[PDB]
Design a protein around this ligand. Structure first.
Ligand code: HEM
Length: 153
């Protein structure tokens, strides 16, 4: 359970992200795909992209980055009271998209890295630890839904 102070650190940096949702979403998906190429393979929509320059030039990838970060921002702003938001997301990601929980760990790393690069003054160690806790809570709660459905592994 995050404390109120931890949530304030999370949402203070997240308010900075929302000034350029699309640039953050590009940076995060590109980092995810470069660091963990198995993740790119899960996207029929993107797996034609073979270089970082091609990824940066894809408007559709930029659009999807906004979709992803909008869903995550709505979850973070619930401060843990996010059951209604996680139900459909766990269902799609477990049963339709077939995304292992481990790949959610990978995107969480990519998010933390990009936030550190773009917002160092608001993303010191205290805020890094709080965002790590928030993303752990996200993964814990999604993993419980995966397990219900027979996909935790
Ligand atoms: C912070 C974590 C993530 C969030 C908030 C998120 C959110 C979303 C949302 C909102 C959609 C569209 C609605 C839906 O299908 O449920 C979507 C689609 C999708 N997501 Fe995620 N996602 C996350 C992580 C991942 C990861 C790590 C992968 C793959 C490694 C992935 C793969 C996909 C795929 C394949 C689609 C469908 C894309 C398409 O063909 O339109 N997601 N995601």
């Amino acid at each position: 359970v995050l404390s109120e102070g931890e949530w304030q650190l999370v949402l203070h940096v997240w308010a900075k992200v929302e000034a350029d949702v699309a640039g953050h979403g590009q940076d995060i998906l590109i980092r995810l795909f470069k660091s963990h190429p198995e993740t790119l393979e899960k996207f029929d929509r993107f797996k034609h992209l073979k270089t970082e320059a091609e990824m940066k030039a894809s408007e559709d990838l930029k659009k999807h980055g906004v979709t992803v970060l909008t869903a995550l921002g709505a979850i973070l702003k619930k401060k843990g009271h996010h059951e209604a938001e996680l139900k459909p997301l766990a269902q799609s990601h477990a049963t339709k998209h077939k995304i292992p929980i481990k790949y959610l760990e990978f995107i969480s790393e990519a998010i933390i890295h990009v936030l550190h690069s773009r917002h160092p003054g608001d993303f010191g160690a205290d805020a890094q630890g709080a965002m790590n806790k928030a993303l752990e809570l996200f993964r814990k709660d999604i993993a419980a839904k995966y397990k219900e459905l027979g996909y935790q592994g």
